[PDB]
Amino acid sequence: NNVNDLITVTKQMITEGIKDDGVIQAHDGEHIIYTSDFKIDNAVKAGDTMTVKYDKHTIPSDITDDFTPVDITDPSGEVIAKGTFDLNTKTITYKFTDYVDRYENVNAKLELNSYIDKKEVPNETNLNLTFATADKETSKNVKVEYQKPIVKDESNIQSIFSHLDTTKHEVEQTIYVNPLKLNAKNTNVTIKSGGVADNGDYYTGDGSTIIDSNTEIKVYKVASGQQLPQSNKIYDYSQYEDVTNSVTINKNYGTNMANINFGDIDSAYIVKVVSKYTPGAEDDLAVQQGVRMTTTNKYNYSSYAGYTNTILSTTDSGGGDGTVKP
């Protein structure tokens, strides 16, 4: 019962969530906003469906798996349509309720947020984004930019939050240690709740995590000819060398603070940390965790590099209205 041909799109556009500069700052958490205004033909009836298509390179939620499309509701809360999302086709199917049997001259407005899908965009690139409402397409050219490591002599590090589970209250951090493959002497990495400044200085910050013996920490060695994705997200760990049992890990080094002793290294490593957080903290954006890399430089003192992640959120909207059928 697809009625895309009965949906008339009167306005649609793609806009950037933080700054209109033609560049999606994906590691700054910059979202993409797709807005669509459309009319629903009077012939549309309960159970009929329409579709909304996201660009293949975008995804409604970057770090959670729990996306459910927002209802389309009228001003008093009547549900006009219920939506289901197919991740594989990047498509919402909206199914109309008997609202459309009781009202006519029905129109609706969708505001759908999305992020760069790191699986589809492993490295920086130019994209021609194309979104669609009921098969009516609109496009926007953008560049995707990712972050760079903080570099101080041979200390060089970067990290992202790569997953968030709001049911089990776990957050996953993916850390690139020495991505530049430098000769990093006496390498130690600290992971801590709250903040680590670019120069390694600790700060309390505005979020927290819980780090203890039940924190999960895995460490992988990257070969000299292996290239890490700029997205900072690893979807398959199988081609890297698991060296978790060959480095020293102290999950209780300090208060909510773990550290890893690497010694002298000449290679990049990936560290994946799964820590807990305070239930509900995601609604206050109060989940924050940082990393510090220390090495000994050629002048016999320590060089530090720091990196901190936090979370951002968006909320879709779907509204409509109509006049009562006599």
Binding site: G29, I63, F67, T68, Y115, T308, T310
Partner: peptide, 10 residues
């Protein structure tokens, strides 16, 4: 509900 992403603190 909400949809989420990772960001950088500075």
């Amino acid at each position: 509900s909400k949809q989420f992403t990772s960001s950088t603190s500075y």
